[PDB]
Every structure is written in structure tokens, then in C-alpha cells.
Amino acid sequence: GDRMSRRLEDINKAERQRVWDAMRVAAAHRYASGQMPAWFDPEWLQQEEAPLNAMDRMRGEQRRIEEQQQWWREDDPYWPLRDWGDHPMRWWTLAFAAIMAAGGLATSVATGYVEPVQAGLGAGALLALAGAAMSDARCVPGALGVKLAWAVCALIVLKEVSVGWQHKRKRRLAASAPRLELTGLAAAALCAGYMLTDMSGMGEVALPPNPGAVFKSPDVAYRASVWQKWGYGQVQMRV
Amino acid sequence: CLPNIHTSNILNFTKNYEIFKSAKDTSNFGKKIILNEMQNLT
């Protein structure tokens, strides 16, 4: 049909891509440790697509473009919604890092307490590093950056709403209760912004599979491996 | 009815591929970090 042809084309495309990526990784490893046959050019590891799929795409696209042609910026106003290559929440992260650092140092000089500057400059360092890594979102560091920033903002929100700050003690007891103010609110807004833009990388890190997930799997070797790891290596597989 | 699928060639490939992919997660996005370490003068 013209329906099973589409399925077949997509299967071939995906398989060619997966194989190219596995080659790139294994070649990077074999090269970093000497064993490579010296006609090898280490620039071939920057070609992301695949040679075959790239050629198909190029030919199809040129056929299309051939047979079909038988602040404020007035020229293009929607420049912010354009794929520039970084994470959307990248300048906000650096802005918040600068605010945290400045406020922490100012407070700890104006009063005499040593926790404000330590927390402020620690968070500032971590958030500047995350906002540096977030300047190329396709890489692996581009995703670990987002994860690091989310962790730091969550910890800030936690310290604010559950333990409070040392320089905010009062004489009373309900006057000095840990509540959410403006720093915790900004950190919460940042966490929501990371979650609702993109934080989906490194999804293969989780808790390992159970014997409950492989009960119905079609693989005997895999099921045996999982049972072995969880302590059931001697049970009988009447399957 | 059933269309006599076992003597065919598109269905055999798609069958084998779907079963293999449904066995276990095969995406390895975190192994690519080695591709960002090929130049280090240490």
C-alpha cells in the first residue's frame, strides 16, 4: 500500500540514525585510547545526522524547492520566539544569580551575619555555572545545566519556607516563623519556568527494573538477568 | 480472518523490529558525553 510504505520508510530512517550514533560513540572511545587506523579524521564525529539520511533529505528538499517554483524590531517583531540555539530560561538564570550574589553580600555587610553572604554567593556560583552550560541546549551538558539550576532553586525555596533565614529572627515566636517572602517566590517561579519549557533530558536514569516489569516481556535472557539481580536466580521459569 | 502473514517480507521485518524495541529501553542519550571530551590538553 501507500500506508505500509510510510511505516517502512520511517523504520529505515530511525534505524540508520541509531546506528550512526552508536558508531560515533564507539569511535570516540576507540580514538581516545589510541586504537584507530590513522586514516581516521576526528572531524567525522561532528556530523550529527547520518550520511544516508542527509543525502535523502537534501535530494527531496531540492526537488520540492525546484518543482514548486515553476525592544522593538519592525522588520521581524517575533525575534524572541526563534531557535537561537540556547535554552529559553538562560538569561533569567544569570539575572537571578547576580541578584542573589549582590543581595547576599550587601545584607551580610549591612548587618554582620555570615550566612546571607555564604548562601548568596554559593547559589550565585552554582547558578552562573548552570547558566553557562545552558547556552547550548542540544548537548548533554546543556541538559545537566537545567537539572543543576532546578536543584539549586528548589533548595532555596525549601530553606526559605521550612527553616527561614538567620538574620530574620525576632523577639516573639510567631513573628519569627518561616514564611514565603520574595526570594522564595522568585525561586519558585524559576522552578516552574524550567519545568514548563524543557527538562526532559537524561531520561534513562531511574530506578532499575523490577521482576514485575519483565513478567510479560518477550525475552528470556533479559528476564533471567533481572531475576538474578533481584535475588530470584533459583526460581523455576515455567514459561 | 487473518491474511497469512508469516510468508511475507514487510511484515517479518516490522514484526522483528517491533518486538526487539518493545523488549527494553534502548535510548542512550547520556553516552554521548564522550563526544564533548575529544580535545583536552591535560
Binding site: 576526528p42 572531524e43 | 580535545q39 590538553l41
Partner: peptide
């Protein structure tokens, strides 16, 4: 952008051979 691309490529080629 990509301002140190060529420099880094040349350097890594010439140093670690």
C-alpha cells in the same frame, strides 16, 4: 559565533599527534 572553532581544531590536530 564559532570564533575559536578553527583555532581549536588546528591546535588539537597539531599538538596530540
Amino acid at each position: 559565533f564559532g570564533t575559536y572553532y578553527f583555532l581549536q581544531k588546528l591546535l588539537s590536530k597539531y599538538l596530540d599527534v
